[PDB]
Amino acid sequence: GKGDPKKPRGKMSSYAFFVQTSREEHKKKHPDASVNFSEFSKKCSERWKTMSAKEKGKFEDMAKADKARYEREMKTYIPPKGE
Fold first, then answer.
1. Is 7 labelled a binding residue?
2. Is 9 annotated as a binding residue?
3. What CA–CA distance (Å, rounded) separates 36 from 40?
4. Is 4 annotated as a binding residue?
C-alpha cells in the first residue's frame, strides 16, 4: 500500500535503475521467483556493486534523468483536499 495513482515514488537511484533492468532480464527465466522485492534485488545488488563505475555510470545518468522527471511530475500531481 505505497503507490498512489500517477504519484511518483522518489526518483530511483543508479542501482535501482540497474535492478529494474536486471528484472526484465530476469523475467526471461524466473517464473518461480515472482520477484517479491525482498529476494531479487538482493541478487541484483550482488550483480551491481560488482560492475565498474563506467557501467554504473550510464545508469547514474539515467537515474539522473529520472531525477528531472520526478520534479516535472509534481507539475500535475497535487492531491485533492485530503478527502
1. yes
2. yes
3. 7
4. yes
Whether domain 1-83 has CATH 1.10.30.10: the reply is yes
32 assigned binding-site residue = no
Contact criterion met (CB below 8 Å) for 9 and 2: yes
Q: Please, what is the angle between helix 55-73 and helix 14-26, to 10°?
A: 100
Q: Is 2 among the annotated ligand-binding positions? A: yes
Is 66 part of any known ligand binding site? Answer: no
Domain locations in the chain as residue ranges: 1-83
**Residue 10 and residue 21: Cα distance in Å, rounded?**
18
C-alpha count within 13 angstroms, C-beta hemisphere, residue 75: 6
CA distances 82 to 46, 78, 79, Å, are 41, 10, 7
Residue 57 marked as a ligand binder: no
Q: Do the beta carbons of residue 35 and residue 23 sit within 8 Å? A: yes
Method: NMR
